[PDB]
Subunit: 386 residues, 4 copies
């Protein structure tokens, strides 16, 4: 009866009831992941001809942003789920990803991450008709309580070429350790995994056209980067709104203030003006990047390298603004909520913690280096794994 956005807004209102408790507990949010299974949003990005909803990427990422306002962990695993589907859609043949799309929309499969282009501990051995992955991996976001995984391994014999495959999460030889113990993103299950002679069929390798091939295939790392960017904006929007309610309800004026109510304090209003200017700038940069992704995705295999590069620059521009100005909002909001807002039962610092931990996996200094290379030299970004 409701559109995807309304369905996501209804789920997020329910997630918000337990978001503070679940930040303290951590672990796997089994009940929340089951609600995502039952809502049908796991097929949001799948076209209608496969039983999906057929949303544009801007709409899919809008839901990730909506979840990140109340629960950035749920947003992370949800956004990564659609990133895994985008991975098989871009790296494999239609004979592969079409059945995967159909089965996902029908059985509500949850896709987790086991792909790390820097963790080289997992290697692949060829046994003729099948492959075997062996080694350890780190940062396996969404691996727990998932049906499918995107797993990677290095060749060693082929100069260390990276190999990507789509395998069931419960396949023999895969061990999810569930050792994720972080200060933020505490319910993304980004722990480690162990692969011991994990059989991989040739029909499960994502080779045509494979990673980092056509500019269309090179949308994969950009989708990953723009997924985090929508999460960052959502975190800041959620921290801003929760700070707004605390200021208006349970915040007393400083005893030296000239205003009787905190709604009219000049310094408080100045802080809120700063938050607004920052958020409005981030919103437009993120949404423009989302619109450019929609138009680039529509090009399909005809996508040009120049258009891919202009999209990469727009995404990184939004990601820098979302990272820096978003983190400043999550810290400065305490100056308008008051000394009583630091009570442990509120966990108001969770927004800063979640944003602080995720903005580190992609150092801002090297993104500014790339944006400056474009601004000064008109150099397009080089396609690499995210």
């Amino acid at each position: 009866l409701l559109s995807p956005l309304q369905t996501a807004r209804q789920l997020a209102a329910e997630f918000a009831l337990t978001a503070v408790e679940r930040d303290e507990r951590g672990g796997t949010p089994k009940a929340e992941r089951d609600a995502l299974r039952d809502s049908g949003l796991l097929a949001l990005s799948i076209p209608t001809r496969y039983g999906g909803l057929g949303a544009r990427w801007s709409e899919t990422l809008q839901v990730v942003r909506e979840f990140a306002k109340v629960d950035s962990s749920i947003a992370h695993v949800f956004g990564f789920h659609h990133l895994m589907l985008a991975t098989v859609r871009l790296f494999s043949r239609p004979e592969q990803w079409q059945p995967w799309f159909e089965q996902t929309a029908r059985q509500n499969w949850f896709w987790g991450n086991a792909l790390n282009p820097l963790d080289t501990r997992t290697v692949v051995k060829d046994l003729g008709g099948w492959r075997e992955f062996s080694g350890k991996k780190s940062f396996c976001s969404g691996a727990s309580d998932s049906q499918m995984l995107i797993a990677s391994a290095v060749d060693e014999s082929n100069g260390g070429k990276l190999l990507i495959a789509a395998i069931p999460s419960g396949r023999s030889g895969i061990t999810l350790h569930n050792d994720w113990n972080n200060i933020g993103q505490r319910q993304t299950d980004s722990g480690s995994a162990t692969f011991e002679r994990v059989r991989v069929e040739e029909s499960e390798l994502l080779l045509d056209p494979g990673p980092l091939s056509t500019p269309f295939a090179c949308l994969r790392p950009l989708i990953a980067q723009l997924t985090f960017t929508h999460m960052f904006l959502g975190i800041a929007e959620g921290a801003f709104e929760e700070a707004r309610q605390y200021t208006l309800s349970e915040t007393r004026v400083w005893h030296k203030s000239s205003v009787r109510e905190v709604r009219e304090d000049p310094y408080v209003l100045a802080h809120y003006g700063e938050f607004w200017v920052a958020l409005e700038g981030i919103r437009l940069l993120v949404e423009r990047a989302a619109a450019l992704l929609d138009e680039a995705w529509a090009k399909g295999p005809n996508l040009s390298a120049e258009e891919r590069g202009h999209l990469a620059t727009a995404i990184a521009t939004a990601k820098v603004a979302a990272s820096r100005q978003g983190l400043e909002i999550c810290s400065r909001l305490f100056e308008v909520t008051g000394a009583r807002s630091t009570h442990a039962s509120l966990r108001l610092d969770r927004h800063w913690r979640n944003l602080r931990t995720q903005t580190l996996h992609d150092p801002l200094d090297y993104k500014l280096h790339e944006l400056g290379d474009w601004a000064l030299n008109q150099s397009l970004p080089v396609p690499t794994f995210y």
Copy 2:
């Protein structure tokens, strides 16, 4: 044969040949204003039915922004000219502004500013069938070398209510001092004037609906504020482009640098990345406000107070970002141009000086206060004179 934007860019190229020498000289850019007269751009905002070009406000403000990249003083007087035309359009009867629009488009009249809501020195005396303005005025931007002026006066008999009129710039009793001597905006002719029993006919009064009346009439201060905003963006864009060319042509690497060329220095590239993130955020905010102005203007006298309020918030949001981040670009650009870019023949500081002097008339602390009142209390800004 050429669109107004192409005509503006062609003028801006010629203006740039003398912009540095004219910044030192100050005074009235008479040759540059005569080029605007012969270009037809003085009728840009006038609808085609009155002999004008019929551009939307976003297109007119884009030309203001394009002139500001090379000559912010010309952009200032050009934007204020169209602001004066919007003043009679919004405040007076069609029997008044229609002939004014017709004669302006036909004779290329240059409209100047003699309106100062915060200067109480000019008073109006009612003689019966006509009135007379008497007093002193300051900040009369574009008054010199103009054909018409928007002049204001206070009625000390009616509690000090402000009265606005449109009178010929050379009417008996009007004396222009040409004492404009400022560190920035040095060719805006913003000196002082003296009114000695200047006759004002009743037909020249802007009374129906008059200033600060309907939401449509309350677009006048927003157009003024958005005109400065496009100028602020243009100044920053011009300083960026000029710094870019200097970095690529004359700047030498520091002797202790790691790169052999300044194009690859990581600190230089990081600075340009910061400039790009800042500029892209300003550009989207400014263009978004321009689009809402187009949509608001199209409503005409059916414009609601709520839609006017959302436009005011969008304009102020873009003005804060353009003012703060723009001035930071005009200062930090010297860190990538080098110690030899401060030669007085280049006047590279003129962008900073122009932006620094103009951001003072609208103090940012009170704009942040207004934006915070909306962000926290959802209070729409009260329409006032700009």
Copy 3:
């Protein structure tokens, strides 16, 4: 055999072995407080003629700063203990504070805080030869596991004047709730308490000269403010040292870096240069304020209001720099420690959490307001309760 600074450093080393686990646990650090009892440092500020160690305030605050580098909660309760001793020294007669100094140095009494000038719930009733406190109090830092408390109450019969007393922490009618549950300062025991007809003798009242009386007595709020300031500097120094060791031991260079080791990465070195500039500025400001406190304290009751005012300005100046630049260090350090430094077993965010929660009780916007009133108008700050 060891100086007090050497004894403090030796304790700080042992405290650091469990500081991370105790930050998660919260509650009362009973073992750490017993170590302070056996170390003799509870008599650090007491003159040698009363059995104490006779340190100057700069030396006592240096120990607070040294404890804050590894355990800001212990530094908080340790600094407040000496603040309570300064309270009776400045507010009461020598016939009162001399025996208190003697017994404290001889029995290693731990003095806690029950003073809250902004909590009007505790009232005093005059029964004739004695009085009784009744009401509820919050933010009772160091009240648990303490021998003496500085308690306050309001006299609703005399216009609400605040009355301060020094009473045993275990006197009949005093109930400690131990409900302190905060994101930071998690072992300061700053929970709430309830006073049920708690008898207070006239000899226990701090009336001569009493609070906010002479300039010498007005040093009490400045000592409190400077105690937090040394804690803020210590937190930032501790976070810096811990980030330094992590950078040199566990941090790995970004895969797109230009250096083979993280020690030579230009962005990493630039961050550490910013931390050094920030820390050196804070250190000098804090130590300069400590020196003026020593000189002010030496004047005794001959202290002038002007010298007290210049000290207040120097302390607030150092507190602003320590608060703002300190918190920035605690956040930006993650950009040089890396994505693997956010593991929950390290609790590297504890420095930010501790500093973020404590800077809220003294809002910086009003400290800047006070400092501007001196910088512009040369107006000395009015002595008030801290």
Copy 4:
């Protein structure tokens, strides 16, 4: 009748009467340089046994700071004059610098700069008993209206080794072009020069111990760096004080302000609090560097490399804070002086211009790299020319 500091304060009060006019004119401040000749301050740094005043370096640099508050150009040439005397004192034999010291104190010689370790256009040829310098030089601060110059040349035959000499400014073959045309430091005469077969005696070469030899000799670039640092603080202190007088005298409240007078506006006072916190931090860092220079200078040829390095780090720390926070003060002060403070007759932007132009010859990014190398790796700075 007056001490050096009082004499400098009396000169600076007279310089301030014409500082605004002379910023516009530029050129050589002949009258002001003659006042320095007549005051005896040109012998401030010369010991008493040579007819000088015998000031410590902290006192000499204090005068440079005092001049920079009213006239940064005069401060620059005055500070460089004593830097030239320090050059012969550190690089040459007492048989050379002692007569130079005596003649300077007796005849009030003004020493100018012609030393540029990066401008390699001036070469030296050996003719047996004498040398000849030939080439062009840039940035010859204080060369005009001077009696002695420190001139440098490259050997070419000895692998390009730099050679430094002290020669009379009016020697045959030297041509001072007086083409200094800059946006700031407009009266330092930092134009170019031409050397055509300029004879240099062997007794005029500064070779024992020569440049960059002993750690004591390596104080020369540190004195140069600390001279600029005192100038930067003086510029910011002077801009702050001139802004203070304008705010209190001729600054109107914003018409939307709640305060009746500008002395009590909350945003204005906040800005002044920010200025105070910044200035106080810079003052302590600069003065601590000045004290360390005094103690290092007293070591003489016994100065250790470690003590020289710790001084270099302290100086650079003060220089970064003085450069960045000083420039921010010179820009932000316009937000408290108002829109009427940008009048060209005030030249209030001259403080920002002077500081902006000088902070570029020593890029802050590479100083932070050096301070970070110490903060992280305990690496002392490498002695190089300034």
